């Protein structure tokens, strides 16, 4: 029915133009394998682009943008056809119309184009889409805001390369309000967008802090939906990869009790990134390590270090190891860590873990040994390590091919097990 659809689409009559356009939309609207290629091969894409022009019938603009939306929803080669037909400037132009139906269709299409690659993401930005897109969040229609939020997230997504910060940072005040939304779907993509923006340099992290986003993010960690918790925790986790001052902001927002709740999540990936987030907090100063302890975060971490899946165990190891670094300044930190039974789970990790985690682990063990040695000139810990079977593990680590694990395992054996 395609050669007749094509001729009908090229008719000078206006209502059969619409009739054919609708028909093209329906066949392109198939969840699995829409006939995008045969539609493209009909050569109708430029004609559909013409129908989005200013002062075309509103219904015709809607149907054409919808058809082009689904062509752009396909492969990159198929999306390229839409882009090469100069559809993007018209998509953006449609955002300025007064029809919420047309505007949501246009912003949906831009979501597919921007979500294709960093090239098309930046291309959409280059066509100055940010200003009309930000204006969409003042709409009376939840679905329009919902779709615009997803498209906005795609404009912030990607680190290779990152989007122009001077452009995407303009969306920060909007996103700051959007995480106070009642719509769950809006909440999800808004948090994803923030996680992308906060996935970068400390200058980017600071900007997120400056618009007072962290406080509401922490609240969203206890949201009923894991679809909200996941990007929220990711965003929070990204922020605490910054310096101690930036991390303290998240702490003051009450992230530590929230992280305690996430450590018992049924979803493993939430438990892992909870461990990851905590680890980048125990990577801070003595007072921040102490705050983690005071939030009763160590006992579930120890158990996860003992029992959880491997890639969760790694992050739990990071957290306890980073916390042990505060033992030189405050020996009670180590004394508490040992008291909570962290020595054996650390020791058992030496035979299974990767060379980076092995080093993480050896770092933790030596810190425990240093404190135990000092707590005599004022080795129980070395005795606990031997009985945990750890003295043997560390000795075996002297046959490790990597330089820094060898000499570290060597010095541990030489200093505390001579």
């Amino acid at each position: 029915e395609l050669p007749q659809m094509t001729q009908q689409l090229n008719s000078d009559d206006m209502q059969e133009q619409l009739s054919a356009t609708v028909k093209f939309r329906q066949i392109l609207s198939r969840e699995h394998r829409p006939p995008i290629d045969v539609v493209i091969q009909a050569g109708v894409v430029p004609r559909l682009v013409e129908f989005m022009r200013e002062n075309q019938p509103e219904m015709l603009q809607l149907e054409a943008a919808w058809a082009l939306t689904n062509i752009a929803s396909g492969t990159s080669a198929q999306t390229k056809v839409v882009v090469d037909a100069d559809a993007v400037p018209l998509f953006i132009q449609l955002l300025y119309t007064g029809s919420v139906e047309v505007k949501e269709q246009a912003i949906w299409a831009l979501g597919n184009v921007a979500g294709d690659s960093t090239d098309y993401r930046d291309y959409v930005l280059q066509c100055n889409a940010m200003e009309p897109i930000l204006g969409l969040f003042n709409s009376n229609k939840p679905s329009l805001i919902r779709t615009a939020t997803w498209t906005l997230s795609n404009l912030c997504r990607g680190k290779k390369p990152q989007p122009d910060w001077s452009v995407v940072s303009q969306a920060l005040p909007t996103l700051a309000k959007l995480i106070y939304s009642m719509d769950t779907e809006t909440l999800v993509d808004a948090c994803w967008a923030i996680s992308y923006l906060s996935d970068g340099p400390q200058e980017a992290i600071q900007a997120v802090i400056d618009v007072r986003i962290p406080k509401r993010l922490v609240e969203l960690l206890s949201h009923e939906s894991t679809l909200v918790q996941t990007p929220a925790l990711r965003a929070v986790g990204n922020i605490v990869t910054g310096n101690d001052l930036q991390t303290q902001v998240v702490i003051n927002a009450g992230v530590l009790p929230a992280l305690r709740l996430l450590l018992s999540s049924p979803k493993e990936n939430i438990k892992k990134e909870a461990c990851w987030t905590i680890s980048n907090i125990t990577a801070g100063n003595t007072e921040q390590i102490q705050a983690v302890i005071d939030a009763n975060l160590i006992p579930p971490l120890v158990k996860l270090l003992e029992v959880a899946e491997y890639k969760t165990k790694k992050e739990a190891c990071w957290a306890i190891s980073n916390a042990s670094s505060g033992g030189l300044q405050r020996p009670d930190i180590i004394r508490y860590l040992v008291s909570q039974g962290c020595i054996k789970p650390l020791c058992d990790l030496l035979e299974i873990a990767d060379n980076r985690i092995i080093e993480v682990t050896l770092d933790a063990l030596e810190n425990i040994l240093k404190m135990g040695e000092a707590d005599k000139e004022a080795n129980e810990n070395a005795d606990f390590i031997e009985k945990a079977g750890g003295m043997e593990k560390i000795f075996n680590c002297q046959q490790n091919e990597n330089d820094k694990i060898y000499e570290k395992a060597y010095k541990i054996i030489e200093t505390y097990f001579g």
């Binding site: 929803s73 269709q105 290779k160 990869t241 990851w276």
Partner: peptide, 19 residues
């Protein structure tokens, strides 16, 4: 010191079909 576990920069296409 801080650390990221991801480090893997994957620009998977993020698209949605409207049906």
């Amino acid at each position: 010191r801080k650390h990221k576990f991801d480090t893997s920069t994957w620009a998977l296409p993020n698209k949605r079909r409207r049906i």
